[PDB]
Amino acid sequence: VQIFGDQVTEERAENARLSAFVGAIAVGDLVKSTLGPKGMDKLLQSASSNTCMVTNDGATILKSIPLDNPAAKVLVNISKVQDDEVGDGTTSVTVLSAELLREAEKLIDQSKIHPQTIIEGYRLASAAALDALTKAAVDNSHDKTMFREDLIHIAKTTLSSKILSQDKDHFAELATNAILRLKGSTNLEHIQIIKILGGKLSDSFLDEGFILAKKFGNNQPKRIENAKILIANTTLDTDKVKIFGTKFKVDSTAKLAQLEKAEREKMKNKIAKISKFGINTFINRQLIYDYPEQLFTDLGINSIEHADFEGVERLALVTGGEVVSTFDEPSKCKLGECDVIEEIMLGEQPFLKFSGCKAGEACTIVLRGATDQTLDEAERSLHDALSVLSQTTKETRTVLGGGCAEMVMSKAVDTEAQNIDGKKSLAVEAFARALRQLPTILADNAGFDSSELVSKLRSSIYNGISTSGLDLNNGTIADMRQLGIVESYKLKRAVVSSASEAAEVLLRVDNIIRARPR
Amino acid sequence: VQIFGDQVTEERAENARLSAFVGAIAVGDLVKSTLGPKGMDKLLQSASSNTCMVTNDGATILKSIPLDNPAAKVLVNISKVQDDEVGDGTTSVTVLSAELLREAEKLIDQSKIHPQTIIEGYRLASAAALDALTKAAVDNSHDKTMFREDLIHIAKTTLSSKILSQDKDHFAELATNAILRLKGSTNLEHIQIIKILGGKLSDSFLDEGFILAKKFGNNQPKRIENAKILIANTTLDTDKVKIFGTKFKVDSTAKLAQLEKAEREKMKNKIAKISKFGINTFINRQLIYDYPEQLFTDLGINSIEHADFEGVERLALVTGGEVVSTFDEPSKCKLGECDVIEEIMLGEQPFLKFSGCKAGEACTIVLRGATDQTLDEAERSLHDALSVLSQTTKETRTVLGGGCAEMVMSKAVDTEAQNIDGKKSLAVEAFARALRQLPTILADNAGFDSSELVSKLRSSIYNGISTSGLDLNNGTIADMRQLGIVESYKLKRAVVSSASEAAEVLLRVDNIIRARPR
Amino acid sequence: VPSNATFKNKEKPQEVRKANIIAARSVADAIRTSLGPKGMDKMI
Amino acid sequence: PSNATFKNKEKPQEVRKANIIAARSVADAIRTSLGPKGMDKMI
Amino acid sequence: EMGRPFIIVKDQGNKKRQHGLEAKKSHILAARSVASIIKTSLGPRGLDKILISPDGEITITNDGATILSQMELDNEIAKLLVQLSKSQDDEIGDGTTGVVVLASALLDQALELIQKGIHPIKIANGFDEAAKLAISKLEETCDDISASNDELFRDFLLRAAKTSLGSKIVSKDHDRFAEMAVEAVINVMDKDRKDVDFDLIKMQGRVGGSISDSKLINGVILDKDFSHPQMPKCVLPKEGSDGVKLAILTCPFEPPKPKTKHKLDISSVEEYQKLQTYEQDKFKEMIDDVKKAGADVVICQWGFDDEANHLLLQNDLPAVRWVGGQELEHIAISTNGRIVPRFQDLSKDKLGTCSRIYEQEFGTTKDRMLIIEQSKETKTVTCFVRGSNKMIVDEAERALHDSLCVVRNLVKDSRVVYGGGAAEVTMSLAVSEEADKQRGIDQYAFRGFAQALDTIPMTLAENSGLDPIGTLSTLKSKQLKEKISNIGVDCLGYGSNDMKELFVVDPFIGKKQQILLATQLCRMILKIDNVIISGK
Numbered sequence A, B: 001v002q003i004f005g006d007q008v009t010e011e012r013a014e015n016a017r018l019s020a021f022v023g024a025i026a027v028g029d030l031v032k033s034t035l036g037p038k039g040m041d042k043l044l045q046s047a048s049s050n051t052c053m054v055t056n057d058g059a060t061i062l063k064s065i066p067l068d069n070p071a072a073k074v075l076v077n078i079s080k081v082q083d084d085e086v087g088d089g090t091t092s093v094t095v096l097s098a099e100l101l102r103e104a105e106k107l108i109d110q111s112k113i114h115p116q117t118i119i120e121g122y123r124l125a126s127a128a129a130l131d132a133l134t135k136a137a138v139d140n141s142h143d144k145t146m147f148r149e150d151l152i153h154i155a156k157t158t159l160s161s162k163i164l165s166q167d168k169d170h171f172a173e174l175a176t177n178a179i180l181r182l183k184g185s186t187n188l189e190h191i192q193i194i195k196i197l198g199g200k201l202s203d204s205f206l207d208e209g210f211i212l213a214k215k216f217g218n219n220q221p222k223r224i225e226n227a228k229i230l231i232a233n234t235t236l237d238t239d240k241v242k243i244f245g246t247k248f249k250v251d252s253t254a255k256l257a258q259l260e261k262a263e264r265e266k267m268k269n270k271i272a273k274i275s276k277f278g279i280n281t282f283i284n285r286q287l288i289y290d291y292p293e294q295l296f297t298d299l300g301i302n303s304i305e306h307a308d309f310e311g312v313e314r315l316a317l318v319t320g321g322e323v324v325s326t327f328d329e330p331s332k333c334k335l336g337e338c339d340v341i342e343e344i345m346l347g348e349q350p351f352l353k354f355s356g357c358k359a360g361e362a363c364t365i366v367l368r369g370a371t372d373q374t375l376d377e378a379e380r381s382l383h384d385a386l387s388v389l390s391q392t393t394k395e396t397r398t399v400l401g402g403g404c405a406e407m408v409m410s411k412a413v414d415t416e417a418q419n420i421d422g423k424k425s426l427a428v429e430a431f432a433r434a435l436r437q438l439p440t441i442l443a444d445n446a447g448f449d450s451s452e453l454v455s456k457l458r459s460s461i462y463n464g465i466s467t468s469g470l471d472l473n474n475g476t477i478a479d480m481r482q483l484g485i486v487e488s489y490k491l492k493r494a495v496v497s498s499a500s501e502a503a504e505v506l507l508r509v510d511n512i513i514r515a516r517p518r
Numbered sequence C: 001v002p003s004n005a006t007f008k009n010k011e012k013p014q015e016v017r018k019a020n021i022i023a024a025r026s027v028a029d030a031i032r033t034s035l036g037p038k039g040m041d042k043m044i
Numbered sequence D: 001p002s003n004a005t006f007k008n009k010e011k012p013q014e015v016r017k018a019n020i021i022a023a024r025s026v027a028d029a030i031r032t033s034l035g036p037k038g039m040d041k042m043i
Numbered sequence E: 001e002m003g004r005p006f007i008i009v010k011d012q013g014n015k016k017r018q019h020g021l022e023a024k025k026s027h028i029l030a031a032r033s034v035a036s037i038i039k040t041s042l043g044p045r046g047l048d049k050i051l052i053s054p055d056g057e058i059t060i061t062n063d064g065a066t067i068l069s070q071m072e073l074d075n076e077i078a079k080l081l082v083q084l085s086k087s088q089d090d091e092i093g094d095g096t097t098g099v100v101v102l103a104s105a106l107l108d109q110a111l112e113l114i115q116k117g118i119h120p121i122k123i124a125n126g127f128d129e130a131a132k133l134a135i136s137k138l139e140e141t142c143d144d145i146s147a148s149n150d151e152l153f154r155d156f157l158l159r160a161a162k163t164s165l166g167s168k169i170v171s172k173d174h175d176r177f178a179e180m181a182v183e184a185v186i187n188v189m190d191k192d193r194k195d196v197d198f199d200l201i202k203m204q205g206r207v208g209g210s211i212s213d214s215k216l217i218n219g220v221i222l223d224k225d226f227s228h229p230q231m232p233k234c235v236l237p238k239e240g241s242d243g244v245k246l247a248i249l250t251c252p253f254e255p256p257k258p259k260t261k262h263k264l265d266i267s268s269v270e271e272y273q274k275l276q277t278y279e280q281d282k283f284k285e286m287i288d289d290v291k292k293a294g295a296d297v298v299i300c301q302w303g304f305d306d307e308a309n310h311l312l313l314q315n316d317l318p319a320v321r322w323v324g325g326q327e328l329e330h331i332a333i334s335t336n337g338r339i340v341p342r343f344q345d346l347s348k349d350k351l352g353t354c355s356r357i358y359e360q361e362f363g364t365t366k367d368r369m370l371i372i373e374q375s376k377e378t379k380t381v382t383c384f385v386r387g388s389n390k391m392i393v394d395e396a397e398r399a400l401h402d403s404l405c406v407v408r409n410l411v412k413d414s415r416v417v418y419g420g421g422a423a424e425v426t427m428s429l430a431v432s433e434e435a436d437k438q439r440g441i442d443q444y445a446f447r448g449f450a451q452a453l454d455t456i457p458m459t460l461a462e463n464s465g466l467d468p469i470g471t472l473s474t475l476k477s478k479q480l481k482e483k484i485s486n487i488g489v490d491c492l493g494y495g496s497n498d499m500k501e502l503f504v505v506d507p508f509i510g511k512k513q514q515i516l517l518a519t520q521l522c523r524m525i526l527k528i529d530n531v532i533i534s535g536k
Helices: A014-032 A058-064 A070-085 A090-109 A115-135 A144-158 A168-182 A253-277 A290-299 A309-319 A372-394 A404-420 A424-435 A437-445 A452-461 A489-506 B019-032 B058-064 B072-085 B090-109 B115-135 B144-161 B168-180 B254-275 B290-298 B309-319 B372-394 B404-417 B424-435 B437-445 B450-462 B489-506 C012-032 D011-033 E021-041 E064-069 E076-090 E096-115 E120-141 E150-165 E174-187 E269-292 E307-314 E325-334 E390-410 E422-438 E443-453 E455-463 E468-481 E508-525
Strands: A009-011 A042-044 A053-055 A192-197 A205-207 A224-232 A246-248 A281-284 A302-304 A336-346 A349-357 A364-369 A397-400 A468-471 A476-479 A486-488 A509-514 B009-012 B042-045 B052-055 B191-197 B225-227 B229-232 B281-284 B302-304 B338-340 B343-346 B349-353 B363-369 B398-400 B468-471 B476-479 B486-488 B511-514 E016-018 E048-052 E058-061 E201-205 E247-249 E264-266 E298-300 E356-360 E369-373 E381-385 E531-533
Touching: A009 A014, A014 A058, A014 A070, A014 A090, A014 A489, A014 A509, A042 A058, A053 A058, A053 A372, A058 A070, A058 A090, A070 A090, A070 A489, A070 A509, A070 E058, A070 E390, A090 A115, A090 A424, A090 A437, A090 A489, A115 A404, A115 A424, A115 A489, A144 A168, A144 A372, A144 A486, A168 A205, A168 A372, A192 A372, A205 A349, A205 A364, A224 A253, A224 A309, A253 A290, A253 E269, A290 A302, A309 A336, A309 A349, A364 A372, A372 A486, A372 A489, A397 A404, A397 A489, A404 A424, A404 A437, A404 A452, A404 A468, A424 A437, A437 A452, A437 A468, A452 A468, A452 A476, A486 A489, A489 E390, A509 E021, B019 B058, B019 B072, B019 B090, B019 B489, B042 B058, B052 B058, B052 B372, B058 B072, B058 B090, B072 B090, B072 B489, B090 B115, B090 B424, B090 B437, B090 B489, B115 B404, B115 B424, B115 B489, B144 B168, B144 B372, B144 B486, B168 B363, B168 B372, B191 B372, B225 B338, B229 B309, B254 B290, B290 B302, B363 B372, B372 B486, B398 B404, B398 B489, B404 B424, B404 B437, B404 B450, B404 B468, B424 B437, B437 B450, B437 B468, B450 B468, B450 B476, B486 B489, C012 E021, E016 E021, E021 E048, E021 E064, E021 E076, E021 E096, E021 E455, E048 E064, E058 E064, E058 E390, E064 E076, E064 E096, E076 E096, E076 E508, E096 E120, E096 E443, E096 E455, E096 E508, E120 E422, E120 E443, E120 E508, E150 E174, E150 E390, E174 E381, E174 E390, E201 E390, E247 E325, E264 E269, E269 E307, E381 E390, E390 E508, E422 E443, E422 E455, E422 E468, E443 E455, E455 E468
Parallel strands: A192 A364, A224 A281, A246 E264, A281 A302, A509 E048, B191 B363, B229 B281, B281 B302, E201 E381, E247 E298
Antiparallel strands: A009 A509, A042 A053, A224 A336, A336 A349, A397 A486, A468 A476, B009 B511, B042 B052, B343 B349, B398 B486, B468 B476, E016 E531, E048 E058, E356 E369
């Protein structure tokens, strides 16, 4: 008796547990070679428009590639959350969560361990892993000099896994200063990224000001000094008033010419109130017609049209001014100040460059690349670096990276495995061997040994030295404090917590039910 | 550029490998549940004719199941070679050869070892395993009492996995006495197996003398006392004249009437030469016509016709005589004597029974079962038991079984692994853990924890006691000398040699080129 | 008490044995009506 | 010798070989269009 | 046939008919296929299951109500078990996996009785009489905990909370989940400890962070941010205050216009110039009514035009736009405010009061969400759940939702039981004892109902890797030697089979429905004879 309908795929037996674990192996092996500074980028073939996308980030790779396996969708969702929360480590979460299923597969098959026992084994194992990172965290926020220096070392680690590892020394200061300009702001929508094609990759710079791609409408000069910037969001172009039930009752067209002329009088009266501020520049996010633009010619006021609303907030923070509507009251309204405003040209498209702005709360990053694939990679590489440095201003705790943080956690896991006894010792020790995979894959992508090199790092920590780490350049054990490899503490907890929770998902699935597609 | 053609499937490098490993896991998991006395039988349903077969033999399972994987046929052929040379342990060969690849799969992955380096590890490990297994063997046949008792212990071990395991206590004497009566000659053509419906499995009894299903002549009596048995190669049939190649030229029918009468007198004179022997029984290889049959009634000679090619040699050795052809010289071809030629009936088909013959060189086994599915396995269960007992006559070296032999061989592997420098030492230790997978499955199929039984057995042997083994009845460690588990050295040597060579072939495959099927 | 000893794996044989018993009892139900002097003949 | 790392993957180096062949095939098509002696291409 | 087509009903060959023993065998096996699915997920050692929707979305849960809801079936007998667990989740909300196992256990024991020649109605008549004997027996064993004060009453709520939190994913945090689920009812409840309103507690999920960030926040959580975000994110009250004076408005900010379609005819320039002044006078009047009332944060249902962005910025008045109508009801309950339909009716007494209004950054980008806190005990408690996976944030909702369904059932007076299989064993021996006194034709009916109750304790031993025979024999021998009914199956292996020391507590109203829903459903299934199923 079949209760299910036609074309319903279900596995109630070993085929289900095998497909769930193997399904995560193909996902883990895909992003395995992308871990570390020696990793290689992946290519994405689009099914439409033939648009190729090359990205090292594991979040985009898993979401772009279609996956019908529910065991694979679990590792895709945790990568989207890791990208949206911390902003980095989407590959480390997918790899670490996949290795937890690798050690859990041999316990159920060979060791004959209960599935919940493996789950309950990670519960007491993750408690020792998170407590090990707390004692190893150092707070440098007590000194502004030591805190600013740590922001540079964190950027060098994130930019190493991407294509920027060669120029990351020059780009570490650009990402460090950009976060210092925010003054603790964790919002990345205030920083504009303008991608320019051509030139050297090392020519990327960060100006102090707001670089706008839009240009002045007609007669406004390109360069002007001592110009007050004003921002107006609403209307000012052929005002419709408000209600749509207004009409003009005209007995003869002689009066109709006076009704339309009164509309232009409302335009002249509104622009006349703007000149009372004494501003040399006016900016509207809505496009400005030809009639209201000509009124600024005799007043010597600049005009800018078609500004995006997400750029208005970016523009208001650079000028330090205030968005002003209802111009009737000059007192309560505030205007922005700028030393000099010049229209430059980068490539074929001319740009609007600002300099000498009062407020530094926002900036604009300009990038250079040989291909658009490198431009799309340079923007995502900085988006992952600026996200970690933004959360560092909130939580200032940092943990050394480069294989050091993974092995320190495994030291406390092996200690708690003795007091548990039972059959959970095989599950707790499986979590310690799963932490060995992250520093091991770092050596695999560089062509090093996966056994003796890892054993040198493990034996050095048990001798009383917690500062030992893995050096991929020389292929030996080096000190992480001297090399300057460190990551944020929030990134360390996010990878361990997300992988431990994602591993508890697929281990609880005995049966997989697939409804007929629609 | 595609040189091969259309519809040509090929895998290279990482695509080629892991196809043989998973292919071996799929084959290994089918016979994994059939290993041990507590193992479960597998039912095979054919795609045509709706024929089902219940068999516990790992060789017969792989031959029936179609497999398109080129690496799967590697484990199928070694199961046939093990079945051809010995006939027992074909399941252990498929499992052990699969466990060598499962351990080598993590060697190339975790430890990053070249596949050819792993091959050099098995060469040094198998050399030390055969030396430890040879020294553990005990000499046999020096005493006729100990030689017969050892054959009883072998039959109980082989039938333990078979469906005969319940009645194998009484069947140990059935299979033992058949080998002792062979008088040193090793052949299974001399052993007959007859299937009978009805009764119970333990109703199978040993046949004193030789029993073969035949029928007496029409006028011939059933019971003859002290009858002489003769086997004739030549058949009584129309011979034309002599050389064939001829036809009679008849000018007048007066000579044609006496011509056919002359042919009747030729076969009559041939029986007259047979009657000079004074035999009460005659056996022919092919159908006998009714004309020569009537000459046997007046002479008191029994007639047996339609004798199979194998039944000619089976009957000739039991009586002691030889096949007679020319009949000319009475002194040659001295004939034996049978005490009781009286026919009995088992079921609805009467079976001709003999008793009190001169030689027991040929045997017959009567088997009774409820269904043919049991009778099909009952024949193959004794066929595997009689094969090892027959090889024990020529090969007297025997070792202790029941999971003890695999653990003793693994002890010498870990001893020499410490003196082997380099990365190939990891492949040597992997061969030792692969030998521990066979006793591990023995505990899994019996419902007992494998981690507890193997750990207690592994540590007990390193203490110097090599007589420890696995007891599945009490679920603890017991002595193999007291339980009476003995296996031939040729059996265990063929398992280690065939599995080590089969795994070596699949590790040498970096590419698989599949031509278009016909 | 749990989490120790062993855990049952590959439970498909537990379902295969149930599928074989249910299929065998279904055949025994048709012949059951023919048992005893009150049984009926089966035309095939 | 036997202590070397096999890396388990020969695919990464084979994928780059297929990418270079297709990339050079595109650059070789416009090769005849280079210089004052170049030839026009109609698309 | 006589040579003419004989069709009684349209789609003759499409529909099929089942009758006799074959119709009953197909109904029992349809329930056995659903039972073996639910029996694996029953108990704290159970396992979840993946639910693939036709749209591609996946769902991982052990809940029998959620699994069967998204399950696409064919046979109608298996579809009757779908609404069986749905009946358990809608009203009680606890024990959805137990009603399916118990119902199929009644059908398994009924199939053996049908083969013996028992009429199906006689089987259903025996289960109805045996159902009231089991409920009346368990009702006398339990005791009333209402004599304890409010200090001990909170302990019983923590006992039954940790029981329902098990068997589901993210069961390691159940210690904090049990504390947060009880404090929601402590804040929102009647003074007489009766008829608590469940609708005042809302479940709001959030995807991100970790499970350790889940905490109780009393207030309103909205997905809309402050309009014109030039204002500070965290709003603070004045030095001295009665409160924040939160304002709620269902009317957008616009010059007054008739609801009907209107035509405003301007026949002269003077009439057009008056509209210019009349336009700005209304936006100046609407912003002054809020300032004179002392209100700070203004909530608009339809939003407002960009004209008021800088107007509300001068007066430092936070504002939100495009707030849903259902959320407006949730806002007025937390702050105890009153919705103001128009500025003419705006007064200081209709303004809400909350402790603090602020927004959280959450992750990197995501979206902006507003959070409201209360300074004292209020009638609104909003659940805040975080997780590293979309599946965890989803299942945790219904995990705590079912946990709140257990606590609200304990609000009912004088109903408590102890779980762990101790309830089914106690009610099983009471039915088997009556079978010896009654005898007759119904003697085999009480035996089938007694063996069906023991299936739940035996199912718990399967997921824990125990022996169902040795475990059930110990429980039956304990109830005969001593009258203590608190001995039951322990799937956690902590020892002390007494439920009193293990604190496991279940509602009686939840266990009483399991017998009623299983017995009354099998009574209808056994009456089915002709099965007509049309082709799709």
